[PDB]
PDB file of C-alpha atoms in Angstrom:
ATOM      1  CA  UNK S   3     153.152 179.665  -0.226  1.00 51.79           C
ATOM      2  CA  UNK S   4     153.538 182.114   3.044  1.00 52.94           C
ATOM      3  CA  UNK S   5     156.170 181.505   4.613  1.00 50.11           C
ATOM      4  CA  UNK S   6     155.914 179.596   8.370  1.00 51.03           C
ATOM      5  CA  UNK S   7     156.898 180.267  11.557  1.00 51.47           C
ATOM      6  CA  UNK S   8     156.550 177.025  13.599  1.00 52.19           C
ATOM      7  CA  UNK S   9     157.286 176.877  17.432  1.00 51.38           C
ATOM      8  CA  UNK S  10     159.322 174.018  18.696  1.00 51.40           C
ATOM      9  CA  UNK S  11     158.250 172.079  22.536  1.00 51.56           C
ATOM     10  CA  UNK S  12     159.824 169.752  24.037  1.00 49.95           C
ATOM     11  CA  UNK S  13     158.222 167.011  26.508  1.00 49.60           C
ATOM     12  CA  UNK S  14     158.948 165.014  29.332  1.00 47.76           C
ATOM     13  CA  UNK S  15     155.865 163.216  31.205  1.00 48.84           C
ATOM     14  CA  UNK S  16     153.488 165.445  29.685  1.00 49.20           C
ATOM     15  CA  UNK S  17     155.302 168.391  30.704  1.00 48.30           C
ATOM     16  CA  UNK S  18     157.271 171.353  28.605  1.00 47.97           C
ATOM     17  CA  UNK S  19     160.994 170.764  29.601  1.00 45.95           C
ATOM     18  CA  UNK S  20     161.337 173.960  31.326  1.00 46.71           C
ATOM     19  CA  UNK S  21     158.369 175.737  30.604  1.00 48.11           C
ATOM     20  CA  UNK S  22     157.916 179.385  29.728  1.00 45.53           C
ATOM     21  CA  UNK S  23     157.620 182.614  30.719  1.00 43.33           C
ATOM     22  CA  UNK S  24     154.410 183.248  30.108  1.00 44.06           C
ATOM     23  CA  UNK S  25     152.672 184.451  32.935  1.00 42.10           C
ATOM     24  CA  UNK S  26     149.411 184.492  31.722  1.00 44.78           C
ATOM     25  CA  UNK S  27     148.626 181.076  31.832  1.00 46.05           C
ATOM     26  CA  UNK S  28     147.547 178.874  33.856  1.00 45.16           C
ATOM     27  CA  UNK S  29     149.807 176.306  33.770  1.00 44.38           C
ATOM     28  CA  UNK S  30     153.150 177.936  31.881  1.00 44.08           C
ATOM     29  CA  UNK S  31     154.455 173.973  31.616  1.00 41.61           C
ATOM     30  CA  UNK S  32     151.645 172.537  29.982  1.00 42.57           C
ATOM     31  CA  UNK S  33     151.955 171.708  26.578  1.00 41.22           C
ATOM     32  CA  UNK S  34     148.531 171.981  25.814  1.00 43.42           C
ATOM     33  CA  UNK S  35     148.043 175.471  26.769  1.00 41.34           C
ATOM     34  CA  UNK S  36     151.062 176.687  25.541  1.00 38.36           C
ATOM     35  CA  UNK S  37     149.746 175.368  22.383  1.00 37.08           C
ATOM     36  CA  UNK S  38     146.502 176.543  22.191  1.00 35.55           C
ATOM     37  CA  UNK S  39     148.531 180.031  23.573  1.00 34.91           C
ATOM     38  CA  UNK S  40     150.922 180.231  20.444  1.00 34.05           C
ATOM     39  CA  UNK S  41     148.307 179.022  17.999  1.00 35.02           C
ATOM     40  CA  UNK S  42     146.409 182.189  19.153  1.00 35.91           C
ATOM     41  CA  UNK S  43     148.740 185.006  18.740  1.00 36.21           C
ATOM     42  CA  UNK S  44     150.227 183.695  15.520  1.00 37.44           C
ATOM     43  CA  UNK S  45     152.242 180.510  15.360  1.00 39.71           C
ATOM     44  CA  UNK S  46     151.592 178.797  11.732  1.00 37.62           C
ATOM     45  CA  UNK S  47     152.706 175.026  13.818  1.00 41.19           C
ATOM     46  CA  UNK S  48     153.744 173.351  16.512  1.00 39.42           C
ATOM     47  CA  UNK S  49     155.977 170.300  16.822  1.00 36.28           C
ATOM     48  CA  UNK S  50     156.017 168.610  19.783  1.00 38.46           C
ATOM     49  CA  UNK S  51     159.444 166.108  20.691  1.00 36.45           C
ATOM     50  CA  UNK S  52     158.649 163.854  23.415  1.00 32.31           C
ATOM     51  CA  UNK S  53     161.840 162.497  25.581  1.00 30.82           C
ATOM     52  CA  UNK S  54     159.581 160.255  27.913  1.00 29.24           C
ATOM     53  CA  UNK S  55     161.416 157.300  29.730  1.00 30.00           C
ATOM     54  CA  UNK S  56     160.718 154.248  27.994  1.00 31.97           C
ATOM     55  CA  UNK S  57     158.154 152.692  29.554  1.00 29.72           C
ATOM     56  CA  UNK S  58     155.350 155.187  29.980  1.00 26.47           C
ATOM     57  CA  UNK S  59     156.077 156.829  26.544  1.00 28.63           C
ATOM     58  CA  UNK S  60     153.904 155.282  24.591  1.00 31.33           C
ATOM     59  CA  UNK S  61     151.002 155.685  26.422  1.00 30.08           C
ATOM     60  CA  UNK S  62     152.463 159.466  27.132  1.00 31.41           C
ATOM     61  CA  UNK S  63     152.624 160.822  23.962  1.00 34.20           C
ATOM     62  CA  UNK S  64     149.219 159.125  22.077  1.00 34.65           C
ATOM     63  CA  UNK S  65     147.773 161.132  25.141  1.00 34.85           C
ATOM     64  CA  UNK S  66     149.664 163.811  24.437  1.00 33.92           C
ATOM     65  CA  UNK S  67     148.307 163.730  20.842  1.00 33.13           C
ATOM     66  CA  UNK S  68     144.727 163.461  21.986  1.00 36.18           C
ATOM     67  CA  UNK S  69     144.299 166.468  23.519  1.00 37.32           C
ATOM     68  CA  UNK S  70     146.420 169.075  21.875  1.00 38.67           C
ATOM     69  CA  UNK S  71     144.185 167.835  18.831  1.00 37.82           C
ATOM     70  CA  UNK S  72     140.857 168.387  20.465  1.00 37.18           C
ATOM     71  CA  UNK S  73     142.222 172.129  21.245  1.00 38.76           C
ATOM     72  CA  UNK S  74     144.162 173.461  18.928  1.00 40.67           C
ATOM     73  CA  UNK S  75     142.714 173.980  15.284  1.00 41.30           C
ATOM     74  CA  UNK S  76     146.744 174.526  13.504  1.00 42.96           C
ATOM     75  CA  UNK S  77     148.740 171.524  12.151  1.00 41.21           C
ATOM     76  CA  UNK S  78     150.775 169.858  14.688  1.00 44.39           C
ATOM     77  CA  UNK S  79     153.851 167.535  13.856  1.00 44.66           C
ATOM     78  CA  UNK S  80     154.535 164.632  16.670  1.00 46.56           C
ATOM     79  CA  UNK S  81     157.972 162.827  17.366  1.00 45.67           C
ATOM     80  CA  UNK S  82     160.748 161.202  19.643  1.00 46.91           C
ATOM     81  CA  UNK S  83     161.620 157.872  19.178  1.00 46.06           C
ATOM     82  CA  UNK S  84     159.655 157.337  16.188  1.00 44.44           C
ATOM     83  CA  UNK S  85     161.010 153.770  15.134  1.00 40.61           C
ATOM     84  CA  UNK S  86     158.547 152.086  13.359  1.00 38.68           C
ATOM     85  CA  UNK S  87     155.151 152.235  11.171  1.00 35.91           C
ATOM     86  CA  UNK S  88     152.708 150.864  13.827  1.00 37.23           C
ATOM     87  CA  UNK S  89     153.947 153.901  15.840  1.00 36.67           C
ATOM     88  CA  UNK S  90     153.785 156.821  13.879  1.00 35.47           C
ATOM     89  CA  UNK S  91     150.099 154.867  12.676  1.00 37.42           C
ATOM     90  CA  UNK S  92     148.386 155.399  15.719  1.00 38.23           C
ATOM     91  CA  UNK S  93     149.946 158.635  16.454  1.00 37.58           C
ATOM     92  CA  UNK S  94     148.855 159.794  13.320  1.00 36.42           C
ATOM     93  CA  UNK S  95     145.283 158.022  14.122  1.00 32.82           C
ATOM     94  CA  UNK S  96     144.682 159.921  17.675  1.00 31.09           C
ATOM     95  CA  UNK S  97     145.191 163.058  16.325  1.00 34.26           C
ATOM     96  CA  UNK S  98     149.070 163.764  14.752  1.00 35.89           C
ATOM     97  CA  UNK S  99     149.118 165.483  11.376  1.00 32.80           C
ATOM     98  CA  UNK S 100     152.508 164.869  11.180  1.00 32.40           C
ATOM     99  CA  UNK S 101     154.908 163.138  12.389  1.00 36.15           C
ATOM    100  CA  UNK S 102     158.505 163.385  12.693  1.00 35.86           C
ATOM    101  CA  UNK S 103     161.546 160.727  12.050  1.00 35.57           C
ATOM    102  CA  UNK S 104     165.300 161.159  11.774  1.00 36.62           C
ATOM    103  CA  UNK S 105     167.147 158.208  13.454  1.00 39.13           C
ATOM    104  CA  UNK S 106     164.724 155.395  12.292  1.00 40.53           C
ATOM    105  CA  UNK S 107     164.546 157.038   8.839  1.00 41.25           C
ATOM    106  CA  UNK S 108     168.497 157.027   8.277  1.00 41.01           C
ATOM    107  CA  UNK S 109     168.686 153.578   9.514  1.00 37.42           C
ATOM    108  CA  UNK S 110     165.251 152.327   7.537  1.00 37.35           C
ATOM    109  CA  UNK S 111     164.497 154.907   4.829  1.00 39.12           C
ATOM    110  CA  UNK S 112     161.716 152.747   3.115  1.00 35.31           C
ATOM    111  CA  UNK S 113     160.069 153.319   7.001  1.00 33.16           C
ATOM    112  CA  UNK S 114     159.283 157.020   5.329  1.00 32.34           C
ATOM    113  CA  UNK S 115     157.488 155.294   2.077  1.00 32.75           C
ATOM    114  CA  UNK S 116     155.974 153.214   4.604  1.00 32.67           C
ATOM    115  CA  UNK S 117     154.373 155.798   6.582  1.00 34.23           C
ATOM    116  CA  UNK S 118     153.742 158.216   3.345  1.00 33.47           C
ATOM    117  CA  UNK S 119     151.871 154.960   1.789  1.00 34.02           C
ATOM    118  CA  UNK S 120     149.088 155.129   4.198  1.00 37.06           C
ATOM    119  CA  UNK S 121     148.905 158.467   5.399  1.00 37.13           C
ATOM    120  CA  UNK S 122     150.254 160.945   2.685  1.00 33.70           C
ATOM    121  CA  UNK S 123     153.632 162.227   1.540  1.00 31.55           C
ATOM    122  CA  UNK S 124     152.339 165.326   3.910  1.00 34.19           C
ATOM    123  CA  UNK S 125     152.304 163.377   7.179  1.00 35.42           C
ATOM    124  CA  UNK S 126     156.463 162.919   6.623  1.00 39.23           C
ATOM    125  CA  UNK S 127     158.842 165.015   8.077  1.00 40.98           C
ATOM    126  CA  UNK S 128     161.907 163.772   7.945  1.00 41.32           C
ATOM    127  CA  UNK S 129     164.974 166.510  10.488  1.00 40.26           C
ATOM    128  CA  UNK S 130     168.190 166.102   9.131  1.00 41.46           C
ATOM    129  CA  UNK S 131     170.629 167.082  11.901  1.00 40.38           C
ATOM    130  CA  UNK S 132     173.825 168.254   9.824  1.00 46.48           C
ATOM    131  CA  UNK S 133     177.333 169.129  10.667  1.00 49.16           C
ATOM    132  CA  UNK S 134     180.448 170.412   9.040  1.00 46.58           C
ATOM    133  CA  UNK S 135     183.034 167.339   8.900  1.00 44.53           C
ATOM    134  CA  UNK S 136     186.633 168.142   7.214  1.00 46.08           C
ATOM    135  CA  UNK S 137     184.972 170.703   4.853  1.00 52.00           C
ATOM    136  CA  UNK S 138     181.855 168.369   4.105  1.00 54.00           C
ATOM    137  CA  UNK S 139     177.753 168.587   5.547  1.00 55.34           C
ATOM    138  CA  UNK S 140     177.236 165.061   7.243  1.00 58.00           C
ATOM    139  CA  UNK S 141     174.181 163.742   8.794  1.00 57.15           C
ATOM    140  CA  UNK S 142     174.451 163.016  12.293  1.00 58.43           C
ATOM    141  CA  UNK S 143     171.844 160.383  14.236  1.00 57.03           C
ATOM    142  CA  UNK S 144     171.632 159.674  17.816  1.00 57.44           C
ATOM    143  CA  UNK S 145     170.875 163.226  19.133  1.00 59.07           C
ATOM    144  CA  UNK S 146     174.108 164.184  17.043  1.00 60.19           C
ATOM    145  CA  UNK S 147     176.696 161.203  18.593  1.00 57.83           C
ATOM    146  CA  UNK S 148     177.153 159.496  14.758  1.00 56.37           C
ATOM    147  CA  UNK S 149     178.684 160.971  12.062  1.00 57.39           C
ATOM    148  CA  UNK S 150     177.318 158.661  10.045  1.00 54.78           C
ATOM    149  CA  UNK S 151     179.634 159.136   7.277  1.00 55.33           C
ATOM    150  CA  UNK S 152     176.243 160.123   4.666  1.00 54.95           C
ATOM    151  CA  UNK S 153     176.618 163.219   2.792  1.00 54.02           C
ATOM    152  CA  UNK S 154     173.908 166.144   2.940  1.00 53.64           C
ATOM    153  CA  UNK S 155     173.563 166.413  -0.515  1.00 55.88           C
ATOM    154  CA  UNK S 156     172.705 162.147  -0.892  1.00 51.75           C
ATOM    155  CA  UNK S 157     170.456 162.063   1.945  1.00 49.72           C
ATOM    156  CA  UNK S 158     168.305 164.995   0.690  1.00 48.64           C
ATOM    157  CA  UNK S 159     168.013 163.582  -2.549  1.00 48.35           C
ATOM    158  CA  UNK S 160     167.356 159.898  -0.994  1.00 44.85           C
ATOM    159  CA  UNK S 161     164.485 161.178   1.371  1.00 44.85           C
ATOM    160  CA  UNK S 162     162.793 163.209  -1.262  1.00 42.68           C
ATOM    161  CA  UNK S 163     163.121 159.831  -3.517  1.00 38.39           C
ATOM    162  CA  UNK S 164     161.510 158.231  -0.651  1.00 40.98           C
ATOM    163  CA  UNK S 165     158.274 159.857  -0.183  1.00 39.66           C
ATOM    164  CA  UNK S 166     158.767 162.450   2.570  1.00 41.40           C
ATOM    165  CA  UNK S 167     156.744 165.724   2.847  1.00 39.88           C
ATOM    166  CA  UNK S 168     159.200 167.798   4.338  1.00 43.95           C
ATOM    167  CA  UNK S 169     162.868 168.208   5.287  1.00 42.42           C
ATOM    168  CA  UNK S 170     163.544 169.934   8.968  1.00 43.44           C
ATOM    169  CA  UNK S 171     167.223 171.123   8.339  1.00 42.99           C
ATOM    170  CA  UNK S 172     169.038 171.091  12.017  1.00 39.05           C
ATOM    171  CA  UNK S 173     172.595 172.832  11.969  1.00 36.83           C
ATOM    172  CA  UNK S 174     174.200 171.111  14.703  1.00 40.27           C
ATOM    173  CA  UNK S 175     177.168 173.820  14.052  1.00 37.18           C
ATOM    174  CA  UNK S 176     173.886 175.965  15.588  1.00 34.83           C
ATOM    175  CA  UNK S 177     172.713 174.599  18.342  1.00 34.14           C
ATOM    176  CA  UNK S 178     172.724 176.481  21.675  1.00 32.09           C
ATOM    177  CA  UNK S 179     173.820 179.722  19.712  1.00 32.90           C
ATOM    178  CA  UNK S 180     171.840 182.924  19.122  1.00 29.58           C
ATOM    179  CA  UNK S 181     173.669 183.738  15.891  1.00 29.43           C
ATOM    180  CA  UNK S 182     171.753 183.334  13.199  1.00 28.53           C
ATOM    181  CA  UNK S 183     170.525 180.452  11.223  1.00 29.18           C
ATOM    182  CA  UNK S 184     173.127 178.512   8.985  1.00 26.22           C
ATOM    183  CA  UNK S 185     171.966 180.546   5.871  1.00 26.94           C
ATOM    184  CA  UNK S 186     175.052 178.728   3.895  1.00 25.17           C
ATOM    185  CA  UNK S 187     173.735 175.162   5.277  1.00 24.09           C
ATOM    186  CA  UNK S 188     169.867 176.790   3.835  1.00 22.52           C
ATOM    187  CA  UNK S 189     171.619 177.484   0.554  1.00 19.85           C
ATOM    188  CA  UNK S 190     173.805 174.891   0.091  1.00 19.46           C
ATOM    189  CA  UNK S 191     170.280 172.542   0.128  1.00 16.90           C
ATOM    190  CA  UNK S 192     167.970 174.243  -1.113  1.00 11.96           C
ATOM    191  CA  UNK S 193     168.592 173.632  -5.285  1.00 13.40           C
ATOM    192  CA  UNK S 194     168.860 170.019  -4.414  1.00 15.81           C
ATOM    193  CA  UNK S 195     165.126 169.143  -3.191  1.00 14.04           C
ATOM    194  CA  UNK S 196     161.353 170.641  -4.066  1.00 14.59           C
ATOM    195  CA  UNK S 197     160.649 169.861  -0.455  1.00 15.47           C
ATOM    196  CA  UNK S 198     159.715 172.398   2.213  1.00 14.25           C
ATOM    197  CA  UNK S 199     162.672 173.297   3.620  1.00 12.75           C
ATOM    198  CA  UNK S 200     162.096 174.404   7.686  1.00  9.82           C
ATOM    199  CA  UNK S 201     165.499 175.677   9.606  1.00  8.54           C
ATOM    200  CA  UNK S 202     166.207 174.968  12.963  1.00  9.61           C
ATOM    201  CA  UNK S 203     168.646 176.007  15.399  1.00  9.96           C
ATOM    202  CA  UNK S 204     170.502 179.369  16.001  1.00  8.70           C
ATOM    203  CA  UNK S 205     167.857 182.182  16.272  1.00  7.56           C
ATOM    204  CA  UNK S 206     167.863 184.794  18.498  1.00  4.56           C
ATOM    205  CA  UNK S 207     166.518 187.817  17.059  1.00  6.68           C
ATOM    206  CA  UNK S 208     163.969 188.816  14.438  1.00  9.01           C
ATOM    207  CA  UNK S 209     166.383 189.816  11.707  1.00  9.65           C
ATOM    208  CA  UNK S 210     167.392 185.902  11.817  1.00 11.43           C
ATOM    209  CA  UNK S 211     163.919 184.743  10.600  1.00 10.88           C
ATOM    210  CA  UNK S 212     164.493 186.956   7.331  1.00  8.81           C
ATOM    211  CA  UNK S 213     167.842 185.805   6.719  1.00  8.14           C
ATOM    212  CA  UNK S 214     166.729 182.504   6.489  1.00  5.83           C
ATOM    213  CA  UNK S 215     163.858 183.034   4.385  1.00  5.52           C
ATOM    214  CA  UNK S 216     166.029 185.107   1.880  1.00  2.63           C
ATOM    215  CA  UNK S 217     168.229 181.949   2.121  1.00  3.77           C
ATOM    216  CA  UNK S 218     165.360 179.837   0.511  1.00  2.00           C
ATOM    217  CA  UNK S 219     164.000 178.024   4.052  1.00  2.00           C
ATOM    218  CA  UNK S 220     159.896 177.239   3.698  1.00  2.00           C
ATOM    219  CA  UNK S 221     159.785 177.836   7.473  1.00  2.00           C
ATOM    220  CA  UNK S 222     161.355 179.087  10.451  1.00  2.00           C
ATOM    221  CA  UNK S 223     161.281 176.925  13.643  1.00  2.00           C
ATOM    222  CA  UNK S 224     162.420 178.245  16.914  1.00  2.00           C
ATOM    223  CA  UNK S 225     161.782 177.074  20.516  1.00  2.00           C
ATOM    224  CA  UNK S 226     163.484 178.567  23.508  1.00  2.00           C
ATOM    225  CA  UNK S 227     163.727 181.924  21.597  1.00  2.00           C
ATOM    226  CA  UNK S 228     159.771 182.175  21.777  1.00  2.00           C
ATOM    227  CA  UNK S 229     159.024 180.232  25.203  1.00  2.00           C
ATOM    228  CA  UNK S 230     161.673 182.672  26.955  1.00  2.00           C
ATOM    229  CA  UNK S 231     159.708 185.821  25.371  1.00  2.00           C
ATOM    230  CA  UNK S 232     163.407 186.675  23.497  1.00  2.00           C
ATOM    231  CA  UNK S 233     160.903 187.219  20.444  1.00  2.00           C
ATOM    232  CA  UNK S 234     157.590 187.727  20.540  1.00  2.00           C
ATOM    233  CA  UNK S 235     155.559 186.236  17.767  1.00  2.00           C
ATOM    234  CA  UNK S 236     153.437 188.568  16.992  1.00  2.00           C
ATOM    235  CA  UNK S 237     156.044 191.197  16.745  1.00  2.00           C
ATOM    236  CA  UNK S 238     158.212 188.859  14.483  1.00  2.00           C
ATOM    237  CA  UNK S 239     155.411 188.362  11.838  1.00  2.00           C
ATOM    238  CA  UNK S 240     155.004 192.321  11.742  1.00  2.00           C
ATOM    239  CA  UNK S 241     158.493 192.873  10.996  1.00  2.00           C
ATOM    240  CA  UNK S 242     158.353 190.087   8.507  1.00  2.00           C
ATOM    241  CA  UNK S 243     155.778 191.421   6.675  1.00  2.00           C
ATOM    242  CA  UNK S 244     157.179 195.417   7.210  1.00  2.00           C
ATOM    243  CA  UNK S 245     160.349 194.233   5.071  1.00  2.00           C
ATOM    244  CA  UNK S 246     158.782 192.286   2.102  1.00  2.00           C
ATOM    245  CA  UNK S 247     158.286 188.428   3.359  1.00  2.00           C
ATOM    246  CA  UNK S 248     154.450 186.724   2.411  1.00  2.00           C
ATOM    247  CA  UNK S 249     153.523 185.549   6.254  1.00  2.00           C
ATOM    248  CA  UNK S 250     149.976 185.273   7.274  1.00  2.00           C
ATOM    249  CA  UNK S 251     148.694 187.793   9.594  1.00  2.00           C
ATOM    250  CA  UNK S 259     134.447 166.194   7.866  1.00  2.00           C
ATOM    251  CA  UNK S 260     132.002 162.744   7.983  1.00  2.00           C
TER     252      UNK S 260
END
């Protein structure tokens, strides 16, 4: 398949945590229109991550759901806090083609057969968040605070087992940088599942995006990188395409 570029927002309250620099629109902090924006010059998905206080959450991100589906015409993937069936359900229901679990997955893993029982293999994604530990890839939980002492290599294996979609690889060695994506961390994975592979964290210019793909990622997901205006989309898929990689250009 083409390869994917999928843009990353995060959400507090209904609102992108700290916006973007498109001047353009309307409202540069709302999700929706940022959305709709990306989906129109060239984004493949979004993912939305919701970090809403506890007690309006609910209720903030099935809205949430509603109307980036009645706008936007790509996939979307939905998650934060994701703990149990009934909630991913009615996410999924009001408009979520995806949705996304780490935490609740490591903890639970039959909660990813759960969820692929009713609503397809295709509605999983599970995001590993993975760290170098004494020589060793662990998987991290709690917004990286565990090392939960689980190897890479078994939980990729046990989550494919279990019925997910799609893996969301997170270096944590990554995050905040603008090096590059963990190609090794890409590599070191990739002969071990049939899954999509997407990578997350480190990009920061074009020539990133086609590192990773040689490296054998399914997608590209970036966030800050594109809601900055660092890289512009459209520009990135050009330059994809200029050096060899396949991206695209109910009763």
């Amino acid at each position: 398949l083409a390869k994917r570029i999928d843009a990353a927002l995060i959400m507090k309250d209904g609102r992108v945590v700290k916006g973007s620099n498109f001047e353009n629109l309307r409202d540069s902090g709302d999700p929706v229109e940022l959305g709709k924006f990306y989906s129109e010059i060239g984004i493949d998905e979004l993912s939305f991550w919701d970090i809403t206080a506890s007690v309006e959450k609910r209720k903030t991100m099935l809205e949430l759901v509603e109307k980036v589906a009645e706008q936007i015409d790509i996939p979307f993937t939905v998650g934060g806090g994701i703990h149990d069936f009934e909630t991913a359900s009615e996410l999924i229901l009001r408009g979520a083609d995806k949705v996304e679990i780490n935490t609740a997955a490591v903890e639970n893993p039959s909660l990813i057969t759960q969820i692929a029982q009713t609503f397809g293999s295709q509605a999983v994604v599970v995001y590993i968040a993975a760290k170098r530990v004494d020589g060793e890839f662990m998987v991290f939980t709690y917004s990286g605070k565990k090392n939960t002492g689980i190897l890479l290599r078994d939980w990729v294996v046990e989550v494919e087992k279990r019925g997910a979609g799609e893996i969301v690889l997170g270096s944590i060695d990554r995050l905040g940088t603008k090096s590059g994506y963990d190609t090794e961390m890409i590599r070191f994975v990739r002969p071990l599942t049939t899954l999509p592979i997407i990578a997350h964290r480190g990009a920061g210019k074009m020539e990133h995006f086609l590192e990773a793909f040689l490296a054998g990622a399914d997608a590209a997901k970036a966030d800050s990188v594109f809601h900055f205006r660092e890289i512009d989309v459209r520009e990135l898929k050009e330059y994809l395409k200029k050096h060899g990689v396949n991206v695209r250009l109910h009763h």
